[PDB]
Structure 1
């Protein structure tokens, strides 16, 4: 029907992977080849769908999660790989069709603002007298250490605590252009599929 706006995805600074931003769409008209031509797509790993069928079907809803993420560490977002990524930062949900795009945001796209460092969390737990009680993530949900991690990390392995909860960050600087990551999940409605391609 109406045009969906990608200027939420095309302004400001893309946040780190633990504090990812969601872009739930409902009842509009998309053209994903307009979106994916602004970037340099280096990976299009999909699950239970093809990249051809992602831009042709009508859905009831459309969701996009985007964050700043270097393409070096592209072998940690892969489904099944218990690592300081899928345990503490972002675990992809697989009871739905999804695709994972990794971009290489160019110099001409000046509307994106480059951050200072990339960042992720190396542990998020709760202390005891017997050890550490790790708090693993949930599929598609935020980490429980998000209210602690939103104070800012300044050095590698700089912890933050309030009561029993503890987190630990890790930062490293940005070289070259910016690289992002787009997790594009769809959902099939039973009766009304009003998110159709733009014709």
Structure 2
């Protein structure tokens, strides 16, 4: 990196160079500053109302909530909660602080201890077939923790229900709350239950003195997509003033890169945020602020 002659020596892999023209690599420019551009978001995200709720939903009628206008600073949970299972699928955990999420959804329910392994793509079983299913190409995170001190009663809590019989398996992210009569044998059930007719719902029997495999667990699943579809939930990073006409390192809503920024004459439709070139490379981007 000293002189062009030294560069030619390095490229040729020798110490002596004869006479020639010896084309070198190129003209390269390094950046000077690093800039960050995040939207104007101030309110903390309602972690308490989701995780620290007074009650959850039954597994067959699982609950879904929409999350928007948040600052995803999950350090606040460090003193109040302890999670037994936490696994993400589309991202690496260490990057969760340098991204903005677009269409966040939170799913909540409660299951038995020995069934947390079934909340994963490609699994099979009672929960994975009749109650709750995940798509093959899932992008999100799964969190599960023990809740013995809350969802267990001395006489036995009979408020949480689960389905036991179904004619066919579910499709991903589908709900079923029908309470008909399941026919197992051959004689039609024609209403009332009988010898080969069953009520398809049964209640979990939760006692404070059961084994660890029979104790209740609370499960929350977070689903989102990352780059396209301009985002609304963002992580805890500080924005900096925009620098243009110079080569810099830029982080726009989680997209990182290096280059020079100039004004453009393009006009985006209201639902578009990024614009790419012919060879699938990002060349145009809107600005969160201004």
Sort the Cα spacing of 1:29 and 1:114 in 2 relative to 1 into closer, same or farther, 3 A.
farther
Paired residues of 2:107 and 2:222 also in contact (CA < 8 A) = yes
Paired residue for 1:16, among 58, 66, 88? 58
> How many Å separate the matches in 2 of 1:35 and 1:75?
24
> How many Å separate the matches in 2 of 1:96 and 1:75?
16
Alignment of 1:1-199 (within 5 A): 1=41, 2-9=43-50, 10-35=52-77, 37-105=79-147, 116-117=157-158, 118-124=160-166, 134-143=167-176, 146-148=177-179, 167-175=200-208, 179-199=217-237
Flag as ranges the 4+ runs of structure 1 deviating above 4 A. Answer: 112-115
The structure in which a higher percent of residues are strand is: 1
The Cα shift of 1:86 comes to 0.9
Counterpart in the other structure of 1:131:
none
The Cα shift of 1:113 comes to 6.5
Gaps of 5+ in 1: 125-133, 150-160
Instruction: Mark the structure with the bigger radius of gyration.
Output: 2
The structure in which a higher percent of residues are helix is: 2
Q: How many residues align?
A: 171
What's the RMSD between the two structures over aligned residues? 3.0
> How many Å separate the matches in 2 of 1:71 and 1:33?
26
Task: Return the TM-score normalized by structure 1.
Answer: 0.70
Task: Return the TM-score normalized by structure 2.
Answer: 0.50
